[PDB]
């Protein structure tokens, strides 16, 4: 299954705390946005965190998280 | 229910590649007898055509069809020689109890037919250039009978 580890969680969770402004519900701007603000070494990891950032932004849109 | 389909235009009958390759050999084998020129070996009783084969060929005109097949095969690949023609008529030898392997063709019979075409002068060297090739008279011998067989 596609369950994400605490290294994937912490990074994506820390972005929406402080950089909540900017990134939209949209993915393909967030993939780009995540890389610039913070260092992510690999290409596979940058999508997986950025997918979870947009998952959090949907949950922030839906209610208080 | 008859069979469907054509090409858009009715196919041109000019060169040898348009002819189906087995039906070419059926005609030109008979051409070698009725012309007369080409000439027989002594050894025809023996042979079988390969080291790998365990039996002699059934048809008594096995040499003419081989000389028919090799002459058109010069038109397909221009440059080739005797070790080349050993590969093209290769076959599965049956080793025995062991697993099967490839093996090369006979070198006497494949060389001799080329020397008989050299005597007429359809296929020739090429003394410096490595590998035999068909000449000008070689093509017009082929291409005149390409139109005949479909007709």
């Amino acid at each position: 299954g596609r369950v994400r580890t605490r290294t994937v969680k912490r990074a994506a969770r820390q972005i929406v705390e402080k950089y909540y402004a900017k990134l939209t519900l949209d993915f393909q701007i967030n993939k780009k946005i995540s890389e610039e603000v913070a260092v992510i070494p690999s290409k596979r990891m940058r999508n997986r965190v950025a997918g979870f950032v947009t998952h959090l932004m949907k949950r922030i849109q839906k209610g208080p998280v | 229910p008859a069979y469907l389909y054509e090409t858009p235009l009715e196919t041109r009958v000019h060169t040898v590649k348009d002819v189906k390759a087995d039906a070419f050999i059926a005609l030109y084998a008979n051409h070698l007898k009725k012309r007369g020129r080409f000439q027989l070996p002594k050894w025809i009783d023996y042979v079988k055509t390969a080291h790998a084969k365990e039996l002699a060929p059934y048809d008594p005109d096995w040499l003419y069809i081989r000389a028919a097949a090799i002459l058109r095969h010069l038109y397909i690949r221009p440059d080739c020689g005797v070790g080349g023609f050993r590969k093209v008529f290769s076959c599965r030898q049956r080793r025995g109890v062991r697993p099967n392997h490839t093996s090369k063709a006979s070198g006497k019979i494949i060389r001799y037919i080329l020397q008989q075409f050299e005597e007429m002068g359809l296929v020739e060297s090429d003394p410096e250039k490595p590998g035999r090739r068909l000449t000008k008279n070689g093509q017009r011998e082929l291409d005149v009978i390409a139109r005949q067989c479909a007709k």
Partner: protein, 187 residues
């Protein structure tokens, strides 16, 4: 358009009976039984293939005869010609009516209620009844011509016509009733 071998038309004809309907893949259809395509990722892509493809695909056995689909295309192309020869109509309508009647209705599973290996009556699904139909068609035709100097195409043509029929001479229609012998008793 779409015809098998160009001599037959998929258009027209019909499924024989309710059930085993839609499981079969006709309707649209491909000239030539053969298709190399992905049919085994989901578990009901198996009934997207047209059953003439599933016949030629499962006709290769055993270890020696596996592969060589081009070879199984030929002997089925001859078989559909022979079916046409006798009781001429549609090879496909006779073949579809064969694989309708070919496979078994019920089956004995082992449910013991702990300890024992005890049999119990269970009806067969529509997919498995098509799976068993085409298998039982071929294993009659292969066994029929295994030692006899009879071409496999002959066995297949004969086997298919017999299955459509209620003769029971066939290996398939026997092995239907051989299972339904014991499946009656296990009730």
């Amino acid at each position: 358009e779409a015809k098998l071998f160009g001599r037959w038309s998929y258009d027209d004809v019909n499924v024989s009976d309710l059930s085993l309907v839609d499981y079969i893949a006709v309707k649209a259809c491909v000239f030539v039984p053969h298709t190399a395509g992905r049919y085994q990722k989901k578990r009901f892509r198996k009934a997207m293939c047209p059953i003439v493809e599933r016949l030629v695909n499962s006709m290769m056995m055993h270890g020696r005869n596996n592969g060589k689909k081009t070879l199984s295309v030929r002997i089925v192309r001859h078989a559909f010609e022979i079916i046409h020869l006798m009781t001429d109509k549609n090879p496909i309508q006779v073949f579809v009516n064969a694989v309708e009647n070919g496979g078994p209705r019920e089956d004995s599973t082992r449910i013991g209620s702990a300890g024992v290996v005890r049999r119990q009556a269970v009806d067969v699904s529509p997919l498995r009844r098509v799976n068993q139909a085409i298998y039982l068609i071929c294993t009659g035709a292969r066994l029929a011509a295994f030692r006899n100097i009879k071409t496999i195409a002959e066995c297949l043509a004969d086997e298919i016509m017999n299955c459509a029929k209620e003769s029971s001479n066939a290996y398939a229609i026997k092995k239907k009733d051989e299972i339904e012998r014991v499946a009656k008793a296990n009730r």
